[PDB]
Amino acid sequence: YGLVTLLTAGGERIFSAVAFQCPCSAAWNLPYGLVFLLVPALALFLLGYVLSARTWRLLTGCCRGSLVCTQISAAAALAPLTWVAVALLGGAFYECAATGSAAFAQRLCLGRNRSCAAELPLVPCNQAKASDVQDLLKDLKAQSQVLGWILIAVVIIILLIFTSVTRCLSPVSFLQLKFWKIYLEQEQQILKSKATEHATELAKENIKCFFEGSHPKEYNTPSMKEWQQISSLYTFNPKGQYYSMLHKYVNR
Amino acid sequence: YGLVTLLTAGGERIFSAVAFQCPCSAAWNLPYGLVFLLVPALALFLLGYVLSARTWRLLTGCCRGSLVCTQISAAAALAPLTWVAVALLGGAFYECAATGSAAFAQRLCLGRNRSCAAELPLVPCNQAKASDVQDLLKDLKAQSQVLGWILIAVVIIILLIFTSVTRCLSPVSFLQLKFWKIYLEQEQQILKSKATEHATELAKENIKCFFEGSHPKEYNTPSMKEWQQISSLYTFNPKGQYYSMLHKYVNR
Amino acid sequence: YGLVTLLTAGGERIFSAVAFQCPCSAAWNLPYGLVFLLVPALALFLLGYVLSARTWRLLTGCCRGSLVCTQISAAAALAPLTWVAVALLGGAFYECAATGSAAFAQRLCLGRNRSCAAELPLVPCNQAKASDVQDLLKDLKAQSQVLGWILIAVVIIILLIFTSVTRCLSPVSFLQLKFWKIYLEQEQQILKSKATEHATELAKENIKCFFEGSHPKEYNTPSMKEWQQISSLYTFNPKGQYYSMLHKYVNR
Amino acid sequence: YGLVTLLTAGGERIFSAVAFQCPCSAAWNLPYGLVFLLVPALALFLLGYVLSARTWRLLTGCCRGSLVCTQISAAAALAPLTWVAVALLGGAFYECAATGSAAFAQRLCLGRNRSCAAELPLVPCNQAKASDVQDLLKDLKAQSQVLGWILIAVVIIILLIFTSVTRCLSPVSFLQLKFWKIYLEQEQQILKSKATEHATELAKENIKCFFEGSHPKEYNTPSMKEWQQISSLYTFNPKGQYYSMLHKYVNR
Amino acid sequence: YGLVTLLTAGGERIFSAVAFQCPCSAAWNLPYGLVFLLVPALALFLLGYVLSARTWRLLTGCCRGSLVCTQISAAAALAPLTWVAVALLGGAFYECAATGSAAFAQRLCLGRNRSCAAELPLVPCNQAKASDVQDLLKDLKAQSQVLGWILIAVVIIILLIFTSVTRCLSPVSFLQLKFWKIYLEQEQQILKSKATEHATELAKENIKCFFEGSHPKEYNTPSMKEWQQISSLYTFNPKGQYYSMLHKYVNR
Amino acid sequence: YGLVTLLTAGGERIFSAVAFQCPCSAAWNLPYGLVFLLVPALALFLLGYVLSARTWRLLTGCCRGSLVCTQISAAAALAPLTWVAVALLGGAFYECAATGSAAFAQRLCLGRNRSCAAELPLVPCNQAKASDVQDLLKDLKAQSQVLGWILIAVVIIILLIFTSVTRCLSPVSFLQLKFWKIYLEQEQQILKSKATEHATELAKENIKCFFEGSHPKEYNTPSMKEWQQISSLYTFNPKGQYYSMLHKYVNR
Amino acid sequence: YGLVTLLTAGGERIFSAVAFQCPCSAAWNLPYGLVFLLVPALALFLLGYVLSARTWRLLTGCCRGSLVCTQISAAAALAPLTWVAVALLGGAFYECAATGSAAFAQRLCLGRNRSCAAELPLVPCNQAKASDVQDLLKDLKAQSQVLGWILIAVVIIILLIFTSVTRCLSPVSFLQLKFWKIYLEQEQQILKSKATEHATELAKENIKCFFEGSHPKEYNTPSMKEWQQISSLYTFNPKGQYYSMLHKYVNR
Amino acid sequence: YGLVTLLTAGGERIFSAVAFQCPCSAAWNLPYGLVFLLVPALALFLLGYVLSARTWRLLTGCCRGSLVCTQISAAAALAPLTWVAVALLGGAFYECAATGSAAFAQRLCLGRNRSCAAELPLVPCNQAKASDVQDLLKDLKAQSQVLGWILIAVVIIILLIFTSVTRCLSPVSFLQLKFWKIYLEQEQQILKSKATEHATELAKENIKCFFEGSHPKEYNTPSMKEWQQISSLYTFNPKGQYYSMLHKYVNR
């Protein structure tokens, strides 16, 4: 129960602290909103760029290269656009971005009060009492929500076009592509299991020879150059079907 | 419990943020309502256009074609019309679409206050106090609900006519069509299972030959051209009953 | 828990949105009530006309015919009358239908205020304050509930007469009719099961021959013309008892 | 959980809609109460007249007959009298029936206000403020409850006399009648089970002969005329004890 | 859950409708209270007169007779006196019976206000404000509770005397009477079971002979006159101990 | 759940109806309290006089006798004194018995107001406002509680003396008396079981001979005079230890 | 659930009725408090004097004797002192005993108001408003609590001294006394079990001989004089260790 | 559930009755606080002096002796100091002990009001309104809490020094002392079990010889003098290791 109580207390503290006031300030407010827009987005973008095992396979070993890189970058950049869309639909952040550069303000307000740019930043702060800006906050909320929805539409459209073209120009057919993906899944699980038990037997034998203090068995040697050889990425050629480069490396 | 608490917090944030104020604005309001009508509808339309495995079979491989395309498009377009109907029945969105182009306003209001078009947009905003428009918001709600119900009737009617004609002109009878669909279902499940275990044995053999470092078995080769050959779509001819083109491809 | 929470949220949104205000309008109100009466009724009528497997058997195959058609139409039209009865007993819809054509209003009001037809539509809206119409709304509620109950009586009476005559003029007796229906039920379940397993073996054999790449077995052929032949509908003749036309088709 | 939530919502809607206001109207009120008394009673009467399997046995086959018909009609009419008794004990319905024909009103009120018949119908409506009728509503409630209880007494008395005479004049004794009813119960269950499995074997054999496409077995024929012969109703004669006419039909 | 919800709704409706107002009326009130006293009592009396299997044994077969009849009538009349006692202890009913015939009123009130009989019936109605009757309602409540308790004492006394005399004059002793009752209980259960299985075998044999269409077995015949012979009631004679007349009928 | 809900409703009705107001009346109040004291006490006394199987053994068979009768009467009269003690400790009943005969009142009140006997009965009714009686109600509550506790002491004392003397003058010792009571308990249970199964076999044999219609077995006869002989009560004599007269009746 | 509901209702009634008001009365109050102190104490004292099986062994059989009698009386009188201590610590009872004889009052009050003895009894009643006695109630509460605690100390001290001396002068040592008590416990349980089964076999044999009606077995006779002989109490002599007089009676 | 409900009711009564008012009295207050300090402490001290089995071994048998006596007294006096410390930390008791002898008061108050000793006792009673004593109650609370904490420190210090010296001067080492304590624990449990079963066999044999009435077996005799011999206390000598004097008594 200790973990549960500490976690609820931590969550409450975290959220009460991330309370978003949108400080009404003449010049320090724009970055305040901008970081709450971009920085968590950049964070999730980086974590996506990290998590996928597809990129590490290419990166390791002392670092055509465009296609794979843009593919992985988009497959990871899926999510940060979702965060920025959800946030922009939250309305608070962009409403806080109202001030921005003075150009936004001068172009923004209808020019009714003739005193916009001076203390417009008070408009999400609710402290200004001029009727014009009290109506302008609403229009800013509108622009925020609309821009957010337009972005979440553009992202889904781009995902469609990307995956459709990637499914259109491949040489292999569909009903074979499904079987191929099932194959690679099974290969990964089998590799995990059997490599696990083989490392287990290696460790057992060597550690027993150490406890006794005698010569080892010398059963076999997994070649390191062979390991690097099977880490290749592309895994396709029209002639040598040979999926999963490991499987391709059984002819020699 | 962490997932549960985070999900409820996320849901509450999401819904409190998608709070729909319908900002009363002279010109920026129309698109505000229009995107909340169309964009989620377009989103669900695209996801439907994506999800069904029937279309990918046709699309892959470097892209009469009308019939299958309109069939799949309608079978996927079922749902977006449901979203737009539910939303239009919500009333808020179309009520927000009241303003639109000025033509809607000039034709819309009874001309009582003679000051409609100037600040009609305040009518869902509840800020205008002229009696005429305070009554006009109600009529707009009515037009919204009625249009929504008419649309949800037209969509069900169209679905009826579509599925009835598609069931009317087919050469095969009913009690055989049911058995045929059961057959294709069983074939899909059997294919999944046996292809899974065959890929499993392939991976096991090849990965063992790799761990040992010796020649593979060369059991058999699933031909890629054969795979593409069995991905065909139509699966009917009056003479060669041969359902499920895979099954049709057993004569040669 | 995600499904549960999303479903309760969706239900609350759906019902709060289907909130029925009965907009008080001089001319746009009548259709508002009329669609909420008829359209869901038409919807349930269509779904009934769709769901029953009895009609598809007749319809498929390029489309005395009166009797079966009216039987199926009534057996499906059972429910829409129930919806319209429940709704009319709800009172709100017909109360909203008060205005209708002006003929209803002129014949309706007792002529006390002499100003009925002008702004009677306000009477379910509760905005009119003339005593005469404030009493007239009550009488309209009465007419609604009474008409609803009369309809729900007429529908049960018609169902009685229909099923009684259909049970009266049949040649077969009762205690045999029960056994016959049990027989057809068992036949349907047996057909489902055995056709399932036979399609399973067909798919298994053909898919194995495909994986290997060799000739199939050629066990037997379910004739398509035979399938259509056994899809017949009537299933009765005084001489050849032969229930369930499939069973009738065992003599030749 | 979906069914549970939808059912509670439906029940709440149904009951809130069947809210009984007893509209105070000069002439349209009497039928309003009368239908809520009679129509659900007629409904339950019809469902009783339908549900019992005893009547269908007599009715089917192209339609002394008095005794069985009055027996079944009373055995089914048990319940509608219970509904009308419960409703009359509810008090609202008969209180609404106060107005009725003017004869009821003129005979009803004590003649104190001398203005009864004009706007007596307001008396359950609570809108009239004359002391005489405000006391008269109470007496009407009394007459309702008393009449209801008298009816629920008369119905139980009639049930007593009916079942007692039916138990008095039968030739067979009691301790044998109990065993006879147990016998018929067991016979019904055995018939259900064995007819079920026999229809199952019939369907299995015929459907296998169809799948193969060969001649059937011709095991035996349940004669339809025999089926009608065993559907007889009376099942008694002093000489040939032979309960359950099916059992009577074993001599020839 | 449907049954549970419908039952609680029905119970609430039933009890809210059986709400007992005791309408204050000059002449229609007395029967109002009297029926709520007697009619449910008569109902439970009749159900008791029905339920016991002891009376049917005597009644069937075309209808000393005093003793058995008064015994069964008292054994069933136990409960209605309990209902009337509980109700009279409820106080509301007899308080409503205050008015009754005018003789009760004239003898009842102390004659203080000299205006009792005119509008005494208002006294449980709480509408009369004369101090004398406002005190008289209390005395009436007292008379009700006291009479109820005296009745519930008289009924228990009568039950004592009845069962004691019935236990006093019997020829058999106690420790044998207990064993005799255990015997009859076991005999009833054995008869139920074995008659059940024998009717089961009868039905099975006859229904099989019907399905096949051949002659029955003719195993044995339970004689109907024998059945009536064993339905006798008295079951005692000093010489032929022979409990349970069925058992008495084993000598011939 | 039906039983649970009906029972709670019945209990609430029962207790709300047994609400004890102690009607303040000049002459009808004394019996009101007196019956609520004595009648339930008499009821529980009678049920005790009934329940014990010890008395029936003596009573049956056409009805020194003092000792057994007073023993059983006291062993059953234990409880009614407990009821009257609990009630008297309740205080309400005796407080209601304040008035009683006028002698109690004249001796009771201190004579301060000189107007006691006229309307003293109002003193538990709280309607009288003279200070003297408002203090006198408290003293009456005191007399009630004290008398109750004195009675509950006298009853326990009497129980002590009774059981002690009954344990003092018996000839048998203690450690043998315990074993004797265990013996009689075991004998009762064994008799129940074996008599049950013997009656079961009797019924089985006779009912089988009836179903077949043949002569019975004539196994043995439990003599009725023997049954009465073993129903004797005293079960002691210094010479023939022979507990449990049944056991005493094994010598001849 | 019936027992649970009835028990909670009974408990609530019991405790609400044992509500302790301490009636302020000039002379009837002292016994009111005194009985609530002594009588339940006497009750628990008597139940203790009854429950212990040690005293009955001495008492039965037509009634040095000081030591055993005072031992058992103290071992049972443990609890009543606990009740009186808890009650005296309750404070209400002794506070009610304030008045007592007039000597307590005259010695009690400081003599400030000079009007103590007249209406001091009002002091726990809170009705007197003289400051002196309003302070005197507090001192009386103090005297009550202090006396209670002194008594609960004296009782524990006496228990200590009693059990210590009883453990000091016994001839046997400790580690043997523990084993002896374990022995007597085991002997009691063994006696219960084996006497139970022996009485069971006795009853079985005799009741079978009765059912058959033949001579008994005459296995053996437990001598009654022997039973009394083994009921002796003291169970000690320095020479013949022979615990548990039953065990002592194995030499002859 | 009865035990649970009675226990919660008893606990509530007990605690509501032990409510501590600290009666403000000039002279009767000091003992009031002093008994609530000392008497429960003395009680727990006595129960500790009783419970430990170590002291009884020394005490029994007609009563260097200093060391064991002070050891057991301290090991039992652990707890009463804890009670008095907790109570003194409660603050109420010592605050009530404020008055005490007049010397405490005269030395206590700062002499500001010059009227301390007269009615200082009102200071925990909150009835005195002089500012000086209203501040003095706080200082008294302080002195109470501080003294309590100093006492709970002194007791832990004394326990440390006691157990450390007792662990310092013993001849045996630690790792052997632990094993010795484990040994004595196992010996106690083994003795309990085997003595139990041996007493069981003794009782069984003797009670069987009694039931039969014949001579016993005379298996063996546990000598009473031997029992006392093995009850010795010290259990140590440097030469004869022989833990657990019972074990020491195996040489002769």
Side-chain angles (χ1 to χ4, degrees), chain G residues 54 57 166-167 169-189 232-238 240-248, chain H residues 60 188 191-192 194-200 202-203 206 219 222-224 227-228 230-231:
Chain G
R54 173 161 58 248
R57 168 164 287 157
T166 305
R167 281 200 212 271
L169 295 182
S170 163
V172 292
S173 168
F174 162 69
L175 192 63
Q176 190 264 326
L177 192 62
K178 276 205 73 76
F179 155 84
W180 180 17
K181 290 313 183 174
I182 303 150
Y183 161 70
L184 192 147
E185 183 278 339
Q186 270 297 139
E187 163 176 320
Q188 193 61 15
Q189 159 168 7
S232 280
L233 70 164
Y234 72 114
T235 79
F236 185 77
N237 166 286
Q241 53 184 24
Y242 279 157
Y243 319 106
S244 89
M245 293 300 292
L246 187 145
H247 167 218
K248 189 158 172 289
Chain H
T60 186
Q188 193 61 15
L191 176 55
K192 157 171 289 183
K194 192 156 76 177
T196 300
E197 58 80 8
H198 174 264
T200 308
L202 194 159
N206 282 144
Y219 70 109
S223 157
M224 59 80 71
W227 278 99
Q228 181 173 359
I230 73 166
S231 306

Side-chain angles (χ1 to χ4, degrees), chain D residues 47-157:
Chain D
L47 295 174
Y49 189 83
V50 172
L51 72 89
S52 157
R54 173 161 58 248
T55 173
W56 285 133
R57 168 164 287 157
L58 176 64
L59 191 142
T60 186
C62 274
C63 50
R64 183 181 293 120
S66 78
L67 185 78
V68 61
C69 189
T70 178
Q71 204 278 335
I72 52 179
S73 58
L78 175 152
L81 266 181
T82 76
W83 165 268
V84 62
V86 164
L88 183 42
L89 191 39
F93 308 83
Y94 184 90
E95 174 84 318
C96 211
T99 66
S101 73
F104 206 55
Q106 58 177 67
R107 183 181 180 271
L108 173 59
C109 78
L110 300 92
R112 181 182 185 268
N113 199 8
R114 87 182 289 277
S115 65
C116 319
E119 286 187 12
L120 178 140
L122 273 76
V123 60
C125 201
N126 203 3
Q127 305 279 269
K129 270 173 172 172
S131 158
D132 184 24
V133 293
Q134 287 299 325
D135 198 9
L136 184 136
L137 66 94
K138 203 183 290 290
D139 174 280
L140 263 296
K141 186 66 174 281
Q143 277 146 333
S144 58
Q145 299 192 205
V146 170
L147 179 55
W149 269 102
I150 292 300
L151 187 137
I152 200 173
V154 158
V155 66
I156 180 71
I157 289 174

Side-chain angles (χ1 to χ4, degrees), chain B residues 142-154:
Chain B
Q143 277 146 333
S144 58
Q145 299 192 205
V146 170
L147 179 55
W149 269 103
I150 292 300
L151 187 137
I152 200 173
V154 158

Side-chain angles (χ1 to χ4, degrees), chain A residues 24-71:
Chain A
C24 45
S25 60
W28 198 250
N29 181 286
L30 156 68
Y32 182 86
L34 185 57
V35 290
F36 272 109
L37 178 64
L38 172 60
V39 178
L42 187 141
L44 164 68
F45 181 29
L46 267 293
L47 295 174
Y49 189 83
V50 172
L51 72 89
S52 157
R54 173 161 58 248
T55 173
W56 285 133
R57 168 164 287 157
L58 176 64
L59 191 142
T60 186
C62 274
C63 50
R64 183 181 293 120
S66 78
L67 185 78
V68 61
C69 189
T70 178
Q71 204 278 335

